[PDB]
Design a protein that fits this description.
Strand content of chain A: 15-25%
Shape of chain A: globular
InterPro entries (chains A, B): Chalcone/stilbene_synt_C (IPR012328), Chalcone/stilbene_synt_N (IPR001099), Chalcone/stilbene_synthase_AS (IPR018088), Polyketide_synthase_type-III (IPR011141), Thiolase-like (IPR016039)
Number of strands of chain A: 15
Family (chains A, B): Belongs to the thiolase-like superfamily. Chalcone/stilbene synthases family.
Largest sheet of chain A: 9 strands, mixed
CATH topology of the largest domain in chain A: Peroxisomal Thiolase, Chain A, domain 1
Radius of gyration of chain A: 21 Å
Number of domains of chain A: 2
Strand order of the largest sheet of chain A: 5-4-6-7-1-8-15-14-13
Protein name (chains A, B): Chalcone synthase 2
Oligomer: homodimer
CATH superfamily of the largest domain in chain A: Thiolase/Chalcone synthase
Subunit structure (chains A, B): Homodimer.
Order of helices and strands of chain A: HEEHHEHHHEHEHEHEEEEEEHEHHHEE
Largest interface: A-B, 68 and 68 residues
Catalytic activity (chains A, B): (E)-4-coumaroyl-CoA + 3 malonyl-CoA + 3 H(+) = 2',4,4',6'-tetrahydroxychalcone + 3 CO2 + 4 CoA
Helix content of chain A: 25-40%
Chain lengths: ~400, ~400
């Protein structure tokens, strides 16, 4: 009696998934990088570890981060000595912090995106929440539904423990949700808080120490939908194609385990080298089909895992130095905010493009690429089209 | 120059997402329920807690579970006294177990589904992995890509810490991935291992004790795709519509926190009552549009959180006793396997329907419903169409 083909035709959307709003938020505590080596070796009781401190100083000076925003303060750290050691039982304390902070910080970004979008929050049909900072049941998705007053029937996607490539993952996911469901409007929230990874220094664990120089806190929210209502909704970027891959010869490059002492961070391989050696393949797969081979002719968003990733990618491809401007500006002002980073970079790029009177939201160019890099070694690729004005 | 509308038309699939294969697996250790009260009070050193033991005996006798499959053995428990206490530091040990067992057990189910499907594993384009048992970076998705030899460019969706409704969530997700991407073939793996939740008994925590009577281990895998190749691929069920909602007046009904002592389990409200009071609304939303109001005229798959959920739902709706047969058979033989449960029930239903010469894979009926129930209180609804033969 019932036609499933009719139902399917009527149920799906028509156009490309489009980013219609972007809002960001960060903890109020601003931590300068210039003075971080002294602060960090003092709050973790490691002033006697002189050679290690010099190594950290060099890491921080080479980081290309001016400041980061951190939920953790000196007062919180003084009440949690176990978080200040390299390896002490402290997950319960860290979970107590991030179970509340992740949704709190996410709500601030989401309210900003919803205001920019300008449409009723009751029209949000899908919610994607992503964090690498803590886990809980009901998750941060349920908390954000409650905090924001979304409809109880919002369709939720709780992305936990994903790592630094997940800014690309939430876009890859939102694309399918928006494009396959007529009228769908997806709220996407990436909210990352370093209270689960912060820990004291150890001279036999320099990889962990690198994480202490680079990771910072922040949340970014998007509204994504197909078939934007012309002159009511305002397209910013369109997604056209996505991919995810694991680079060869990268087993164990980046591992992070959630333990009784919190989330540990290890680096066993040359991440900048692996990314640089495999970025061309990723570009060819995405852009060969569009007939584009000049990678300076597209706009760039790259997860700034560290400055060396960016520097080696630029060197490998012969990118003009300006291609990574928006990426490096976010790195400089906020550090590596894991999954939220690339979403801050999209916001920086469309704001600077609009502010400076360029012709599109992608620096005056039509096509662009967004990359996420993280454990596996995983590379996420999102091909974007900019919007006029 | 480039047409995004042409790209979008060429990139998407045409028909409904279809389940094309189902395979399951369980740990080899079979634990009888009849003798479980004695075993459990003996391995946890609680034989002196006589009134509590009587309460557990009654829970087990009312469970309607004959046996469960458990990775944990007496030998493993004797090497882990901290797992045998109600509340002792033991997450590191539990994580070490499940980081390996979840992907191992998932691989066994996946290999069975892939064999049934019969097509090259290189045609798997998307991978969804779901577990409520442990977390790691790279996740179980990366481990299963490696173990199975999937292509490194498989698009992965790592569903961690979701809870008991997630059998419905992975179907809701697979539907969009398959339907919006031409040629996509999604491997879906739900793999649940109770080593993170097992713990000793406590007389002030009877809700936790209920979990010890009900949860068991197992993994189920699916191949999902749109546009099946006729006579090469073999449709089993088609997905037509999905929903997810949070029941009113259910805040805190089911909470589970991942702590230094592992995953705790709490029940603060009447779950069978909440599900029963809200199941009609869910059915009306799904079936009003199809013109169906007789809920005995559709085939049923319900997450068997406990037997009282099933009993009250049946009573509420006046379901014939046979509607929940396949659900109760899985409950009886395997217990509550969290997200994988409903996927075992689909397998039981299509096997018994085929075995007994019925006209469709949905007990001879055309339309059906699958429900997941879990933290939030969340209800997941999936409307299914059966296949002839």
């Amino acid at each position: 009696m019932v036609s499933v083909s009719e139902i399917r035709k009527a149920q799906r959307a028509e156009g490309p998934a489009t980013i219609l709003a972007i809002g960001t938020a960060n903890p109020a505590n601003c931590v300068e990088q210039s003075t971080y080596p002294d602060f960090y070796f003092k709050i973790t009781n490691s002033e006697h570890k002189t050679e290690l401190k010099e190594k950290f100083q060099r890491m921080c000076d080479k980081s290309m981060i001016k400041r980061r925003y951190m939920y953790l303060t000196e007062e919180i750290l003084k009440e949690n000595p176990n978080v200040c050691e390299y390896m002490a039982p402290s997950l319960d304390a860290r979970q107590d912090m991030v179970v509340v902070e992740v949704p709190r910080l996410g709500k601030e970004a989401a309210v900003k995106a919803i205001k920019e979008w300008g449409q009723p929050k009751s029209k949000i049909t899908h919610l994607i929440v992503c964090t690498t900072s803590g886990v809980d049941m009901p998750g941060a998705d349920y908390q954000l539904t409650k905090l924001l007053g979304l409809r109880p029937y919002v369709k939720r996607y709780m992305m936990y423990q994903q790592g630094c490539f997940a800014g690309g993952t939430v876009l890859r996911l939102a694309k399918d949700l928006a494009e396959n469901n007529k009228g769908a409007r997806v709220l996407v929230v990436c909210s990352e808080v370093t209270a689960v990874t912060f820990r004291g220094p150890s001279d036999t664990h320099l990889d962990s120490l690198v994480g202490q120089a680079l990771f910072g806190d922040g949340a970014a929210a998007l509204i994504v939908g197909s078939d934007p209502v012309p002159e009511i909704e305002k397209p910013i970027f369109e997604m056209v194609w996505t991919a995810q891959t694991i680079a060869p010869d990268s087993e164990g490059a980046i591992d992070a385990h959630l333990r009784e002492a919190g989330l540990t961070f290890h680096l066993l391989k040359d991440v900048p080298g692996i990314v640089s050696k495999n970025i061309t393949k990723a570009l060819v797969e995405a852009f060969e089909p569009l007939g584009i081979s000049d990678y300076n002719s597209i706009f760039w968003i790259a997860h700034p895992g560290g400055p060396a990733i960016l520097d080696q990618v630029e060197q490998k491809l012969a990118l003009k130095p300006e291609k990574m401007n928006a990426t490096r500006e976010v790195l400089s002002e906020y550090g590596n905010m894991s999954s939220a980073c690339v979403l801050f970079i999209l916001d920086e790029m469309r704001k600077k493009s609009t502010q400076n009177g360029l012709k599109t939201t992608g620096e005056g160019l039509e096509w662009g690429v967004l990359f996420g890099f993280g454990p596996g070694l995983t590379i996420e690729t999102v091909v974007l089209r900019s919007v006029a004005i």
